[PDB]
Amino acid sequence: MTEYKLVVVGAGGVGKSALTIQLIQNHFVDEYDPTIEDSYRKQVVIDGETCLLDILDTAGQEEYSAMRDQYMRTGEGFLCVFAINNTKSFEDIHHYREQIKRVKDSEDVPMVLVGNKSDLPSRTVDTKQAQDLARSYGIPFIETSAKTRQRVEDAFYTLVREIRQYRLK
């Protein structure tokens, strides 16, 4: 059965865990139980093809970690998450994308840019800005809300499709 190794990356507090737990449990994370870095398995059918998603929800990029090179080597597709209320989280996408491409020694790595927390009025990153950046990178851009569940499935399944298209190259 086809297996896809997906990695959710981004700055601290952008909602990497909340997006992952929404896909896995259909439930929004509680602040009184913070999610620890872990992987999750979920079998889904996308465009009539069955597959197993193995998703690694990573710690914030500024948090301490010894597994970044290994997850970037193993990862087949990356969900590059920023939060729409955090300009640094958006600007730092540059750094994460560059590190993934460096580790994987590839200019073409399946990626989706995700602007999370779309429910928040306190927006500091405009949709158009992030759209244009994604066009420059040649990747899809999706705004999501882990809180409201808006576009969460779309974000992950779009990434699977990007990996499928990459495997066809």
Q: Residues in the site for ligand GNP, rule: CB under 6 A?
A: 10, 12-18, 29, 31, 35, 59-60, 116-117, 119-120, 145-147
C-alpha angle with apex 147: 144 to 149, nearest 5 degrees? 55
Q: How far is the CB of 152 from ligand GNP (least distance, A)?
A: 9
Q: How far is the CB of 3 from ligand A1IMB (least distance, A)?
A: 9
Binding mask 50-69 for ligand A1IMB (x = CB under 6 A): ----x-x----------x--
d(CA 50, CA 34): 32
| Neighbouring residues of 50: CB distance < 8 A, sequence distance ≥ 6 | 1, 2, 43, 44
State the binding partner of 75 from ligand A1IMB, Co ion, ligand GNP, none, CB within 5 to 8 A by kind.
Answer: ligand A1IMB
Residue 69, Cβ neighbours under 10 Å: how many? Answer: 13
Contact 112, 79 (CB under 8 A): yes
Element spanning 94, H or E: helix 93-104
State the binding partner of 17 from Co ion, ligand A1IMB, Mg ion, none, CB within 5 to 8 A by kind.
Answer: Mg ion
If the CB atoms of residues 90 and 133 are measured against Mg ion, the closer one turns out to be 90
d(CA 29, CA 34): 8
d(CA 20, CA 26): 9
Which residue among 4, 7, 8, 17 contacts Mg ion (CB under 5 A)? Answer: 17
Residue type, 51: C
Q: How far is the CB of 64 from ligand GNP (least distance, A)?
A: 11
Residues interacting with ligand A1IMB, by CB under 6 A? 5, 7, 37-39, 54, 56, 67, 70-71, 74-75
